[PDB]
């Protein structure tokens, strides 16, 4: 439970969103561990960096770790949480759809395709402002 808890805490820090699915996180951690055998060590190292340097948000950590070897793993974690995939081919496994974080900034306006928005004629209403980040 230590590894999954550390992964979920690091994911909450990296994506900037506390509400993250535990089952999706467990699946992502298992896939990452299958792909990289030392992934837990990299997660731990990122956590030590965050705690030691006292980074308030992922912006500071990303800015201060541009050339550090742990940057690719952090970017990979963010990409996996936002897009729901870890690999980059056609048969890549999808671990999150309609819950992937890249569909959330526009959930209040744009439909996640195979899941309906409210009602068969909702689009007659005016959309929200682009400058208002909805939630999450």
């Amino acid at each position: 439970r230590d590894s999954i808890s550390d992964f979920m805490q690091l994911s909450a820090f990296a994506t900037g969103h506390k509400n993250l699915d535990l089952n999706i996180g467990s699946a992502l951690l298992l896939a990452f561990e299958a792909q990289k055998h030392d992934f837990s060590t990299q997660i731990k190292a990122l956590r030590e960096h965050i705690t030691k340097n006292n980074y308030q948000d992922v912006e500071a950590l990303d800015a201060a770790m541009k050339d550090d070897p742990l940057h690719p793993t952090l970017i990979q974690i963010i990409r996996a949480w936002y897009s729901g995939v870890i690999e980059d081919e056609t048969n890549a496994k999808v671990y999150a759809f309609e819950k992937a974080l890249m569909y959330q900034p526009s959930r209040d306006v744009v439909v996640i395709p195979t899941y309906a928005h409210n009602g068969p004629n909702y689009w007659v209403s005016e959309p929200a402002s682009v400058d208002v980040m909805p939630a999450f």
Binding site: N23, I24, A27, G84, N91, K93, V94, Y95, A96, F97, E98, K99, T114, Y115, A116, H117, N118, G119, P120, Y122
Partner: protein, 413 residues
Amino acid sequence: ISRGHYLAIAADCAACHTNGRDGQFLAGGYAISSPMGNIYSTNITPSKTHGIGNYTLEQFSKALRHGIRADGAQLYPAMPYDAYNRLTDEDVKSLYAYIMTEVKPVDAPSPKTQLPFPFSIRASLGIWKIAARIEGKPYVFDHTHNDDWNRGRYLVDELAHCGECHTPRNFLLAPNQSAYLAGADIGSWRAPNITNAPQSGIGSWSDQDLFQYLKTGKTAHARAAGPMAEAIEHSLQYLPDADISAIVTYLRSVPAKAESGQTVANFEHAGRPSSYSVANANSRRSNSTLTKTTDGAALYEAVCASCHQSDGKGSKDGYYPSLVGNTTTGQLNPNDLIASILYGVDRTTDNHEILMPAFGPDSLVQPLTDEQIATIADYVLSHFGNAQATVSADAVKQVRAGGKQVPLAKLAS
């Protein structure tokens, strides 16, 4: 509209005497799936040759209230004459006037009802009527109650005949007045308990919710489907607000009939914060024509999650109902849930049409087998509805067949 027209609307006498949405008005030919076979509604337009145009007031009253045709042949109790028996003489006269002077005659014979022996002969209905205690004095107002309660009782019992579907029948297919409005199985569908029981019945419903459901069939916790959708869209949506208020007033006074194994109301079932796994579906790619998708959560997500969201709470505007807190999913008897999955929902109120696609064998969108429907219904019950209810493929097959066969129907074999 005229008084006779209003009485015909309230009595819903056109919902069964019209073959369908594209059927001739009051021309009959509509098939009623009785336990012993199909009974066809007869031509009602005042055609002197093919309808009831030759009926006098006395003959029309006999047919409407005692189930006796013009020739003296006994009418099949698919006719709710056991409900129309207590209609007042003035109401019968107004209905007769509306039929004779406001309905255009239709010269087209209706299909004849052919029932298997011993139900072929419509002469044994005499002692069946004797044993059913159908006879009774015309309705009079009970001075102990106010006029609203009396009008609501008249609408419920005599005109709209809610007890025809909501009161269970005994062995002889006669109304069981002991279990008044306690809920009944009417074929593929089940009319739920609508007594004042707080948990078993509609006692916990708000007055506004009950009024809205009766007027429109749409409510945050209940949606009308099957026979009730037809009843609302043909009769109840046209009733005045005073009539619906009177019906609600009478319903609030109906003695409670509790159900076995009921602890919370049908709309008070909270939803489990559980769902399927997207990751588990990756193995089912390249697996068209789902047969290996045996997971209930996966089947619900693939088939049903598009409209009712993955959490089962429906759409924000309420067009797609929330399966959480829904009376159909919250019922201990999952008959209505299976029927809704098999046939969908189709209700046209105020010229605006609801539609749920059907998901039975004859479905156009996504046909489902009995096992698949049972698995989906089990998932819905465990996560959104009554967790104590269970569905098997045999139950789905029975609902498809038209419900459990009544013991009396065995005589025709």
